[model samples]
Target chain A: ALEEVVRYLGPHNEIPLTLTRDSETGHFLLKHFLPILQQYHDTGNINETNPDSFPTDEERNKLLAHYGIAVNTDDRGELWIELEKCLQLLNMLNLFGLFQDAFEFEEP
Target chain B: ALEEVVRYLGPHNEIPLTLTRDSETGHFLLKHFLPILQQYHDTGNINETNPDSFPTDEERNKLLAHYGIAVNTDDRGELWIELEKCLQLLNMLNLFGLFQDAFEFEEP
Candidate 1:
């Protein structure tokens, strides 16, 4: 089991992104982008577990499995990096797209 | 001030889906499908709130209101049905779509 420390870097490198993934928005992001990582796996466009780079499969799969996704793994350890990207992408997608979709009808 | 009880009828209607809105998945659903309802409202394919058909304005508003949606009435009852549809669609969307997106990076 590997652990990836994800840090968020905002404008001007002001606020450093921490390692705690415990917010509602953060959870939403995780749910949205995991597949992209998987897609990258087959294409080999990205690394499976570059530790210093992004999240690894072991890191993402645990949380996701808790949410009930049954992923499969082959021999090359491809699942790890692939799964990591997938989870990270999900977080990004939700942040960029669906958050507004969830809140478009507020009361005024 | 109307409260519409949504009943989920699946298959032979054997297992009637009760109306207890409390679950992580349910909350996730609500966070995902609101926008489609708003889109439907702009297009008028649905009503704002039809007590006989689906969820009404007052019911959804309170939830959405607590969730930080600032909807407007616009002098008509349009906001009610519109907002209600938004919330319902969000639940449905999460149920059918993004839930998978979120969990795609799970373990094997």
Candidate 2:
């Protein structure tokens, strides 16, 4: 799922520079991002061979725009780095759950 | 975490009848519920001896109000049954992630 998300964001190993400006990308992330990461965490592999599982170009464009990545820009290295940070955060949260016996919720 | 939640909801092995009617109970569920369940899913136990880990009466009242459970009424069996359903649903979602290779985010 993570690989597919990366590929969707950047087809042909090229990250879209205009990704951060798209609303669809933001919406996509709001809706689909966590579940995808969760799936990767639960299962070591994603459905790489399934074309249908991957997001369409339009979907990718929206997601990129949400992230503020410019279109047609060569930012694969930076994009992947940020993406890894997100994944790491998720992993960190899961690890915290493992070690902590309790979680308190404070209202704003 | 699950046991703590159950205990907090129903001290002395008795589920509060007015729990469903308390807004604090609902608020508590809204904010602190998922992490508690997730902790149980991961750790298999909650901090039973830690008094600070449980919700206070005010919080419980809010949550009970949210659930519409009346206070001072004996509804332990019914309440637990509903709680188990919720846990089962969470388990089901986790299991679904295991079998399905992908999850699609659909906009409402």
Candidate 1 wrong stretches, greater than 4 Å? A1-51, A54-69, A72-108, B1-61, B72-76, B80-108
Q: lDDT value for candidate 2?
A: 0.32
TM-score of chain B of 2: 0.24
lDDT of 1 at A36: 37
Q: For each candidate, what TM-score against the reference?
A: 0.28, 0.21
Chain B TM, cand. 1 = 0.25
lDDT of 1 by residue, A20-96 (tens): 22222232224223433443443533223222344466856654555454443435433322334433444543332
The positional error of residue A49 in candidate 2, measured at the CA in angstroms, is: 28
lDDT tens string, model 2, B27-79? Answer: 21233443343334446443322333555557655555655543232235222
- DockQ for all models: 0.03, 0.04
> What does candidate 2's lDDT look like per residue over A1-108, in tens digits?
222222232234232111121222321122234333333344643332232244455765554555453322223422222323332333443432221221122211
Please list the residue runs of candidate 2 whose C-alpha ends up more than 4 Å from where it truly belongs after superposition: A1-59, A67-108, B1-51, B56-59, B67-78, B81-108
